[PDB]
């Protein structure tokens, strides 16, 4: 009982009632979001996508958090050429919990 859907350019396989982290979305932390772009739905019986994105499959998900990822330190260094550079990055992420998976 799991489904495959495309959210932020990268596909996720999520089972019922589990939390999945995906790219930042323009949704407030206390609102449900829709994912009608369901790549595949799996159950005891198997249903595939003759046309991409099934026919009526949707996924109900609730936003939980809108935090930032772990800091990543970017170092660029040229050997013997008197060039050093430092940078930091924290990627924005959105935690969402899957509430319901349709057929």
């Amino acid at each position: 009982m799991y489904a495959v859907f495309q959210s932020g350019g990268k596909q996720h396989r999520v089972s019922e009632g589990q939390t999945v982290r995906l790219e930042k979305l323009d949704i407030a932390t206390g609102e449900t979001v829709e994912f009608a772009e369901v790549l595949m739905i799996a159950n005891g019986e198997e249903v595939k996508i003759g046309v991409p994105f099934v026919d009526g499959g949707v996924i109900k998900a609730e936003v939980v958090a809108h935090g930032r990822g772990e800091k990543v330190k970017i170092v660029k260094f040229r050997r013997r050429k008197h060039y050093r550079k430092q940078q930091g990055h924290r990627q924005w992420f959105t935690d969402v919990k899957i509430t319901g998976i349709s057929a």
Binding site: H82, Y83, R84, K85
Partner: protein, 72 residues
Amino acid sequence: RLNTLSPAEGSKKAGKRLGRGIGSGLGKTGGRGHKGQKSRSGGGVRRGFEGGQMPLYRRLPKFGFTSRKAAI
């Protein structure tokens, strides 16, 4: 209010400091390049030097004279 006065924008530049790190830009000789006479401490050529060629103020002939009546 003595701790609220500020100068006009662009009045100060903070100057250039040489040889203080890589990220500061002009470090490691502070913008005077690699070896050479100009890179040395106190190096350089005097005014009018052309590297040995006859200077312009020597190739040309002196002309005229100064009139004392012009100053009065």
